[PDB]
Amino acid sequence: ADQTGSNVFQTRAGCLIGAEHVNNSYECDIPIGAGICASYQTSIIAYTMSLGAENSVAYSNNSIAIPTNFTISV
Amino acid sequence: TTEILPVSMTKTSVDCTMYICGDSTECSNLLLQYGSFCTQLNRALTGIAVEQDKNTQEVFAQVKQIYKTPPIKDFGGFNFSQILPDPSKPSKRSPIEDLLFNKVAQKFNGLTVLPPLLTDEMIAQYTSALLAGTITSGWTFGAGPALQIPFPMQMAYRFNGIGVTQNVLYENQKLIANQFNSAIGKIQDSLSSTPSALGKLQDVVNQNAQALNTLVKQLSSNFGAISSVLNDILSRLDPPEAEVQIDRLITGRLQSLQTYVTQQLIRAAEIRASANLAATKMSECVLGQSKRVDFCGKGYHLMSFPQSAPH
Amino acid sequence: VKQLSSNFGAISSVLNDILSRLDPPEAEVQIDRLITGRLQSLQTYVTQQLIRAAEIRASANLAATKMSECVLGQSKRVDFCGKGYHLMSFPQSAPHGVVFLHVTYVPAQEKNFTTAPAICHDGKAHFPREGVFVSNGTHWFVTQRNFYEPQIITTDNTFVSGNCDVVIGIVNNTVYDPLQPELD
Numbered sequence: 382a383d384q385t386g387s388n389v390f391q392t393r394a395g396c397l398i399g400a401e402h403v404n405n406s407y408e409c410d411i412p413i414g415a416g417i418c419a420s421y422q423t424s425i426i427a428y429t430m431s432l433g434a435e436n437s438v439a440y441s442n443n444s445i446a447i448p449t450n451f452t453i454s455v
Numbered sequence: 456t457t458e459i460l461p462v463s464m465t466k467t468s469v470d471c472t473m474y475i476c477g478d479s480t481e482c483s484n485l486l487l488q489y490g491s492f493c494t495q496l497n498r499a500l501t502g503i504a505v506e507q508d509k510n511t512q513e514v515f516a517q518v519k520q521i522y523k524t525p526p527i528k529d530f531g532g533f534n535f536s537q538i539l540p541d542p543s544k545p546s547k548r549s550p551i552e553d554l555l556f557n558k559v560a561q562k563f564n565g566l567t568v569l570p571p572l573l574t575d576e577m578i579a580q581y582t583s584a585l586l587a588g589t590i591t592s593g594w595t596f597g598a599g600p601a602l603q604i605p606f607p608m609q610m611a612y613r614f615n616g617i618g619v620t621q622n623v624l625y626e627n628q629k630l631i632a633n634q635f636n637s638a639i640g641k642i643q644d645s646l647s648s649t650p651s652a653l654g655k656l657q658d659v660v661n662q663n664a665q666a667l668n669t670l671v672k673q674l675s676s677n678f679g680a681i682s683s684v685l686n687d688i689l690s691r692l693d694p695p696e697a698e699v700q701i702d703r704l705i706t707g708r709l710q711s712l713q714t715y716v717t718q719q720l721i722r723a724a725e726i727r728a729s730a731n732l733a734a735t736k737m738s739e740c741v742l743g744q745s746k747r748v749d750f751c752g753k754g755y756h757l758m759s760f761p762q763s764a765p766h
Numbered sequence: 767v768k769q770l771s772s773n774f775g776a777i778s779s780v781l782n783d784i785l786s787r788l789d790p791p792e793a794e795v796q797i798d799r800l801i802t803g804r805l806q807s808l809q810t811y812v813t814q815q816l817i818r819a820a821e822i823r824a825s826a827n828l829a830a831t832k833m834s835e836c837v838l839g840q841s842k843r844v845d846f847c848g849k850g851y852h853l854m855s856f857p858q859s860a861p862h863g864v865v866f867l868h869v870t871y872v873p874a875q876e877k878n879f880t881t882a883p884a885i886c887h888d889g890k891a892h893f894p895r896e897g898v899f900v901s902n903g904t905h906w907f908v909t910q911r912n913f914y915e916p917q918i919i920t921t922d923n924t925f926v927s928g929n930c931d932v933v934i935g936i937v938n939n940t941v942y943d944p945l946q947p948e949l950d
């Protein structure tokens with residue numbers, strides 16, 4: 382017994398000991414499986430990965446968005 | 456049209472010591488004198504397993520943000536209800552993604568089936584950000600920031616890129632909308648009927664199941680020994696004479712495990728060649744308009760839409 | 767190399783020790799366990815190198831394609847060379863590979879306007895040659911699609927085709943004639 386504790390959490394990929402579950406969602410740091418990721422933010426935390434920042438383009442049948450500048454990226 | 460490509464396969468992980476020996480201490484002790492054949496097999500089958508989670512990232516995770524389609528659906532007469540996610544149904548899969556999912560962790564002798572990192576409810580949410588961002592933006596969201604534009608107006612750019620002026624659309628907008636709606640309507644029927652439509656995704660699953668059956672169904676072969684069970688050889692044979700009979704099953708099962716890993720390394724390179732073409736077809740046809748002949752469809756490309764299938 | 771020190775079922779992993787303390791008739795039955803073992807250790811090495819050398823041959827075919835199409839030209843393929851609109855690319859050599867510096871064009875600082883598919887002047891629909899129709903609240907302009915450079919609407923940047931009845935969303939505005947004011 383390499384060391385069963387109190388932070389026992391059940392994942393679909395297995396069941397994870399030593400990491401606490403938080404109800405937030407962050408970018409995936411350490412992939413565990415089945416949508417669960419782990420990260421260090423201080424204790425080890427285990428959450429559900431966030432796909433990306435939510436967005437909603439302001440679609441309208443008579444509106445366009447045209448850029449007024451630019452940027453050179455290497 | 457419709458083009459089905461496989462991007463990933465099942466992530467299995469076979470362990471030697473439990474497969475070759477199976478809880479025998481005498482057998483396991485004879486196995487360390489073969490060196491590191493099986494640190495190799497675990498390392499090989501793990502490189503295959505972490506590819507399948509990279510194949511899915513490069514295909515679907517093309518968008519930085521998760522775009523949303525507006526609640527009011529007035530796209531100039533074009534009807535996307537067959538590809539847009541269905542709010543009523545629990546899984547939020549579109550009506551066409553439902554057919555693709557209904558048309559296509561097991562304990563065993565050391566076999567394990569690891570789950571994928573991206574669940575099918577996260578893959579079906581990348582495909583609704585790539586598809587609700589190409590309706591409200593166009594190709595502008597794959598270059599920089601998403602720039603809104605009316606659909607009957609960003610579909611007149613796509614006539615203008617194939618050598619047809621803007622008159623042909625605005626003057627035939629209601630006819631073109633009906634041709635697009637009915638074309639999408641017949642895509643569901645072809646998949647629902649014709650019980651060989653998917654095809655390419657099924658043969659990948661069948662070939663991965665034939666491989667595991669041949670691996671398991673070869674744990675009951677003598678390979679020259681008197682029995683296929685280690686317990687019988689240990690029970691009724693004097694130890695120094697059982698040593699030679701166990702070594703025959705060691706070499707037989709170690710060879711049956713090497714040909715399995717070898718053909719999976721060859722097979723995993725076929726999927727990576729199809730998971731790299733689907734990432735190219737997503738970048739060049741979903742996030743833009745392609746001039747390459749017959750790359751995306753048989754005709755002059757206008758636009759393309761992604762729908763997720765199980766693998 | 768680390769697997770040259772494995773018995774493979776023999777009594778030892780050194781050919782000198784087996785030949786020293788075994789008779790010729792039963793030395794050969796212990797060498798064969800090393801012959802077979804070391805041969806199988808060389809086949810699984812060569813086999814995985816044949817598979818591994820076909821991964822590099824696919825990156826060395828993609829790198830030659832990226833050199834021909836992006837360094838020796840300007841690419842129109844999307845996301846093939848950088849994230850943006852391709853301008854040009856530069857090759858730098860790494861020890862066992864190549865590094866591409868993809869110069870791209872990323873638009874920024876966007877502001878939103880009001881469009882119209884056409885513009886009805888003199889009872890005729892006017893569509894733009896290159897660009898879009900936009901309104902800054904009050905006045906209508908013809909600007910290029912990838913950079914806000916508005917221009918007044920004349921017959922040099924619009925082409926007329928049809929009537930005002932068939933288009934859905936056509937607006938009423940004047941299309942200035944470039945030569946009429948300077949007539950005589």
Ligand SMILES: *[C@@H]1O[C@H](CO)[C@@H](O)[C@H](O)[C@H]1NC(C)=O
Nearest residue numbers: 390401402403404405426427
């Ligand atoms: C998270 O949600 C669960 C139920 O959804 C709740 O029991 C718990 O208190 C919440 N907070 C944390 C930190 O787990």
Ligand SMILES: *[C@@H]1O[C@H](CO)[C@@H](O)[C@H](O)[C@H]1NC(C)=O
Nearest residue numbers: 528529534535536537636640
């Ligand atoms: C789109 O087509 C479906 C039939 O497949 C129809 O029920 C629906 O009403 C159509 N969309 C709109 C906005 O009418």
Ligand SMILES: *[C@@H]1O[C@H](CO)[C@@H](O)[C@H](O)[C@H]1NC(C)=O
Nearest residue numbers: 438439444877878879880903
């Ligand atoms: C679009 O433009 C209108 C006025 O032209 C403005 O009120 C609105 O906020 C804009 N929408 C955006 C910037 O999303």
Ligand SMILES: *[C@@H]1O[C@H](CO)[C@@H](O)[C@H](O)[C@H]1NC(C)=O
Nearest residue numbers: 901902903904905906907916
């Ligand atoms: C719009 O453009 C016209 C022409 O340059 C200008 O006179 C006007 O101030 C601008 N703004 C509004 C709100 O009309």
Ligand SMILES: *[C@@H]1O[C@H](CO)[C@@H](O)[C@H](O)[C@H]1NC(C)=O
Nearest residue numbers: 441442443529531934935936
């Ligand atoms: C845009 O939609 C509105 C209804 O919300 C309608 O009154 C208007 O005519 C539409 N414009 C065009 C150009 O279709």
